[PDB]
Amino acid sequence: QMFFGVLDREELEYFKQAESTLQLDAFEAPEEKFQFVTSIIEEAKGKELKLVTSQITSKLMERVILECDETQLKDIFQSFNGVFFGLSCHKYASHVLETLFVRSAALVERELLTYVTMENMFLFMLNELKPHLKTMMNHQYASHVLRLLILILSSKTLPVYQTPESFKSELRDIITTLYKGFTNGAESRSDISQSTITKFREYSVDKVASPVIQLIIQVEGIFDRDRSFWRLVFNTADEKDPKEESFLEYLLSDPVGSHFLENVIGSARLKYVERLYRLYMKDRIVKLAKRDTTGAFVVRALLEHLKEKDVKQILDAVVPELSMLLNSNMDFGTAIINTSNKQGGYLRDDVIAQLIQKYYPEKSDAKNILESCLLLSASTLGNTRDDWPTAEERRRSVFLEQLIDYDDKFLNITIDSMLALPEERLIQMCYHGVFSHVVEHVLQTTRVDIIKRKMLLNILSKESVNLACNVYGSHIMDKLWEFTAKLTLYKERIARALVLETEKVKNSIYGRQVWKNWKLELYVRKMWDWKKLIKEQEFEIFP
């Protein structure tokens, strides 16, 4: 169902102009726009298949589908009856189907909370697709449509709607149909053979099919206690199998295979994950952890989804390697530290000793954790060009914030490192899209000694108004309302500075937030009550 004809000279002129008018959007009322869309639909009657399959017009068709009313949506839907599979396979029409299906899914939701219905129309195309599901899964365009349909039928996030119970049944029937196709009507297992299992493992790591397999393993548990597709990829018995082992060794040394395994571990039954770990990973965890681009993603997934005893076993093995892992794989290092924290600071002394040695050796005079961990001097901080903050900068910031949350030692080291900068450089951080958040992160009132608070405040308070009016700086000013607890003079100085620039501060959307959080309406209108809030805050923060 691939070719439906070419658009002639007149149709091309008309639909180009209509598309142009539609995007200029000069209509003065929604009613005018709807009427114009209707005029487009009227001209498209009998030509819809040509229009969705032509590169020139397929995007107009998506617009129309988005802009028309419910009744028109239904008519456009039925105009595709009998060719859904061919359209799903089409380079341009498949994207039209996706737009259609997503809007249709939203319509069955309100059709549920209140002629032939959208629900029944949707079921008709599902039944038309059922004999093609296997071909779709392997089709470079139709696999995306299949994947979207499974997302819709399982009520998951589309490019999240509630669904009829008929949808839950369709999910079951679609996945079961696919299941019978990838077996041979085996009817148990067994007799599923290798190479049928091997052929399915090949799809598992196939560029086209693999995202569909992942999603299926992810949702099949909604209606299948036995996890049939999970069992198709992996075994369930209590001992190793040679073929499963070689496949596992491939996944753990292959980028797609590792990300596949990483994703399905989060949705597998716990005992199935414990089994893969026990049989194929536990005795080689350190070796796997050192594979930055492959196996390490799997080790991280184990740390996030296994139970306490196994997680601590992995930590026993990987924590001694933490400094070395941090050399090339900071994201993994962050998750290891995070997991140690979640497991009650497990191996804390070893983690801390290593991080101190690597980022803040107490024998070094040049020591500064902003420099060793954020590479501050070589960063985009203070650049005169229009350089946004980079991905590496955000990564290093997230790592440092994790350290600050791990132990007061790193909070105190970070603050000392900020106080060690030239004052201008620390202020620059306050305006930086990523490093500002690091500044905000150290403003933890009950964890920072009052002398340290005074010293930070001596610096920040000079920039009170400009920080308050800034998109990043205003979060810092918000934190300073609590950070100045037990420091009334500092709180009074900042409040006074802001009120002196009342109009400039309230002209900023960020400033108005600070104004609210600093309760400055009270400061101005009912000073006695403001002063009372300050007294109460003190005992609320420091009881």
Numbering used by the authors: 50 to 163, 175 to 219, 251 to 634
Which sentences did the original study use to describe this structure?
Nop9, a nucleolar protein conserved in humans, plants and yeast, is essential for 18S rRNA maturation. Nop9 represents one of three distinct subfamilies of Pumilio/fem-3 mRNA-binding factor (PUF) proteins, along with the classical PUF and the Puf-A/Puf6 subfamilies. Consistent with a role in processing 20S pre-rRNA to mature 18S rRNA, we find that Nop9 binds to the fragment of internal transcribed spacer 1 (ITS1) present in the 20S pre-rRNA. Moreover, the presence of Nop9 reduces the cleavage efficiency of Nob1 in vitro. Together, our results suggest that Nop9's essential role in SSU ribosome biogenesis is to prevent premature cleavage of the 20S pre-rRNA by Nob1 in the nucleolus.
We determined a 2.1-Å-resolution crystal structure of yeast Nop9 that revealed a new PUM repeat fold with 11 PUM repeats (R1 to R11) arranged in a C-like shape. The repeats form a twisted, incomplete ring with an ∼80-Å outer diameter, an ∼35 Å inner diameter and 30–40 Å thickness. Most of the individual PUM repeats are similar to classical PUM repeats with three α helices, but with variability in the length of helices and interhelix loops. The repeats form a curved overall structure, and twisting relative to imaginary repeat-to-repeat axes is focused at repeats R4 and R7. Extended loops before and after repeat R4 and a long loop between repeats R7 and R8 each correspond to ∼25° twists. Repeat R11 diverges in structure from a classical PUM repeat with two α helices at the C-terminal end that cap the structure. Two long loops between helices α2 and α3 in repeats R2 (residues 164–174) and R3 (residues 220–250) are disordered in the crystal structure. The most-conserved residues across Nop9 family proteins are found on the inner concave surface at the positions that typically recognize RNA bases in classical PUF proteins. The most common motif in Nop9, SϕxxE/D (where ϕ is a stacking side chain and x is a hydrophobic side chain), specifies a G base in classical PUF proteins such as PUM1. This motif is found in repeats R1, R2, R5 and R8-R10 of Nop9.
